[PDB]
């Protein structure tokens, strides 16, 4: 429990770090792939202006 070392303080809440990193990774992947897929689908359908 001695929260003195920096690695100690990082390890105390390591689950929070990893969970938030997973959240931001999921957000970026979802919203980049989905917008790219929107553009791909709407430009395959002869609609460049629907991107």
């Amino acid at each position: 429990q001695e929260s003195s070392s920096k690695q100690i303080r990082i390890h105390t809440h390591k689950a929070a770090i990893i969970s938030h990193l997973s959240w931001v990774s999921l957000w970026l992947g979802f919203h980049t792939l989905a917008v790219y897929s929107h553009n791909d689908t709407c430009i395959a359908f002869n609609s460049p202006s629907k991107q």
Partner: protein, 670 residues
Amino acid sequence: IFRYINTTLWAKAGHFNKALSKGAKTTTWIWNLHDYAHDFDIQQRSTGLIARKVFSSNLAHLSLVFFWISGMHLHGAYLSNYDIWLKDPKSITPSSHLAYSLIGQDILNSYTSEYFSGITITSGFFQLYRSEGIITQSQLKYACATSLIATLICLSGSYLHMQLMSKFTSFYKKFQSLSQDHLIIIFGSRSTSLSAHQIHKMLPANPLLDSGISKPSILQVISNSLSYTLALFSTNLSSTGKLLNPSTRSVFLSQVAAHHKTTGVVFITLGLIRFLTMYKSQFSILTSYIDYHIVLSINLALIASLSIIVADHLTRTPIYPHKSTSYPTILCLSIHHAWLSGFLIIGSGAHASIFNLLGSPTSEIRHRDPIYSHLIWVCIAIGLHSFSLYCHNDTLEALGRPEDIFHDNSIQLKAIFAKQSFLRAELQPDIEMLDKKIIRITQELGTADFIVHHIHAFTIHVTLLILSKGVLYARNSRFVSDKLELGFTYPCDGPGRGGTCQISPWDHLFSAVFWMYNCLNVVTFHYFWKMQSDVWGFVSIQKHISHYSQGDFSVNSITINGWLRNLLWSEASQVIQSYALSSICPYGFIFLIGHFIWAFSLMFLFSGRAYWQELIESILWSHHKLKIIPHIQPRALSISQGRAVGFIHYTLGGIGSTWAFIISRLLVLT
């Protein structure tokens, strides 16, 4: 009897397996529930229930196939341009498949006829209908109705047999009865029935269409009443297959009807012969192979071999009218059956392994080391020989030494037995053509054909090595001496003995699926390039031939760079430049999606489940922080499931990539 058919178990998921009775404590329970769904052997109750489940599930699947046939028939009767295709098949692409005008999906339907826009189907159902004398919409209506009735009948039979069969039921174990009645009544007495159908409905009809009367006086002549035409009206002597029908570019249907009659006679005579024939040698096989999994494996291997024979025989032994010119249809009919052959062969290997683990094996498993060792040596020999002739040609062509490569204009490896295999076909010294399109010309086999055939042999042998190694080393091995107790499918036996990952027969199938996929991707590419380069294509009135690939195969397929450039790059221009082009937009999109899925599989293929379990625990911390506790505890996929998901996504993505690549190009060129 039927009072025990109760819905009380519908809500109780996982009832069939006693390992799932503890309840869904973790998410692994869901995947196990889905995994054991059709594993009737390990499910609860006696062996009679196993037989009832197997037979009724067979009937239910048969009803499903009948429903699929009925759907195809209704699409052909009410959602197709089959009328104008009947009137002019050489100018209309088959289409029984529309797309709704939503999200601009209207761009997928393309001009197939002046009154029809839709997706060009390549199933070949229109050629089948024409060969089945189906002309009016009413005929397709009644075909769909009969298929729906068959669906209902088979569904009701599957429902009934779960209670008609009992603990005393034994009709499935009577293999003499099954073989005799199947053989005679189906292969003999139904082949002659189809011969009757053809003689009485095709020859009265298909010659009428070929005689130029697409009118057929409507029903005055088409609706039978044509007993003044004779059965062998236009055989034109000759030999079956030597002379094709000049109008439809196929074998005369009278010859097909005679074939079916004679094959039915042959099957009936074989059923009569089986009363006294050669036996007492396959008798150990007879007694030791009376089990569900062994007969399933035997039937899967047989059906897959028949599928590959169908794939090779549907393309340059033209049976269907107006089908040889429909190049996308020919390509699809070959390649789909090729893939099914590969998949069902792999399934045969898997169920051979399952039979070895459940039943007791035979004598060949005792000298398994020489078998699976000479198989290893032959695989290494033909891999270090077939492929490397490509590597040698590639290296020496890059070095600028074309006279030292394996080509026709260089050191040439003549296909001696194939060049002396003029036995097949044995056609006259020219080609056949219907309408600006080549029907069939003999594939002149040279050096490139020799090398690619050896590549096929090598890939087949390696896939067989994986399958037979899984089968023979299922019970035990020098590595692990109690693999029998570990079951059929297991991730490993532990990191000990250096590491025991993927020793189970299930993992051997897991690798064999990859190797079969790699085996017949080369088969697909060989067919797709060879037909375009040397068979398919336009014509010139001066007897000169302009193929689609302009004869690239004999000059480029000798090197891997030739395959990369002239097949995967130049012939991918149609699919890659397919955006906003009406017919081929979905093919470009599906090409992209297949790439995505194939790359997505690698996440499951390369990673282990412990990392994902730890990540899931890290996320579950945040969930527990906000009082969001999933009591079905989140667990990462099991090792076997991770491998299965990876393999499925890998094969699906790659198959979709090839599928789009070949279909879009053949639709554009045609």
